[PDB]
Design a protein around this ligand. Structure first.
Ligand code: HEM
Length: 116
C-alpha cells in the first residue's frame, strides 16, 4: 500500500504536521484555519490519509463534504493546499514517484472540499 511505502503511521503523521505548518505559513489559505485546533487537524487528517492510502484503519470521522460546506474554498486554494502536501512529502524524503501517487489520492477529495 502507499501507506506502507511511505513508512507507516508515524510517517504519515509527520508529513501531515508539515502540511499544516505549510498551510499556516501561506496567507492565501491560512485564514481558513483561524481559531482551529491544529493538533486535532493533524490527527484527524492523518487518520483520513492513512485510510485513503491503504492503512488498516477505515475512516470513521465526519463526512468531508459536510465538513467543508460554505467554507468558501476555491479550486486555486485547493490546488495551493495540494502544493503544501507535495512540499511536505518531498521534504520528508519521499521519492518523487511516491510523492505523486500520494498527491493523487489527496485530489479525490477536491469535490468534497472545493465549493466556489
Ligand atoms: C483549501 C483546502 C482545505 C481547507 C481550507 C480546509 C479547512 C478545514 C477546516 C477549517 C476544518 C475544521 C472544520 C471545523 O472546525 O468544523 C477542516 C476539517 C477537516 N479537513 Fe479540511 N481543509 C482543506 C483540505 C482538506 C484536505 C485536502 C483534507 C484531506 C486530505 C481535509 C480533511 C479534513 C478532515 C479529515 C477534517 C476534520 C473532520 C472531522 O472533524 O472528522 N481537508 N478542514
Amino acid at each position: 500500500s502507499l501507506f506502507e511505502q511511505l513508512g507507516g503511521q508515524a510517517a504519515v503523521q509527520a508529513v501531515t504536521a508539515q502540511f499544516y505548518a505549510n498551510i499556516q505559513a501561506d496567507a492565501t489559505v491560512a485564514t481558513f484555519f483561524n481559531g482551529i485546533d491544529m493538533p486535532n487537524q493533524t490527527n484527524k487528517t492523518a487518520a483520513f490519509l492513512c485510510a485513503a492510502l491503504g492503512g488498516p484503519n477505515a475512516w470513521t470521522g465526519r463526512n468531508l463534504k459536510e465538513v467543508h460546506a460554505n467554507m468558501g474554498v476555491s479550486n486555486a486554494q485547493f490546488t495551493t493546499v495540494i502544493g503544501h502536501l507535495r512540499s511536505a512529502l518531498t521534504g520528508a524524503g519521499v521519492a518523487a514517484a511516491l510523492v505523486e501517487q500520494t498527491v493523487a489520492v489527496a485530489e479525490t477529495v477536491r469535490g468534497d472540499v472545493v465549493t466556489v
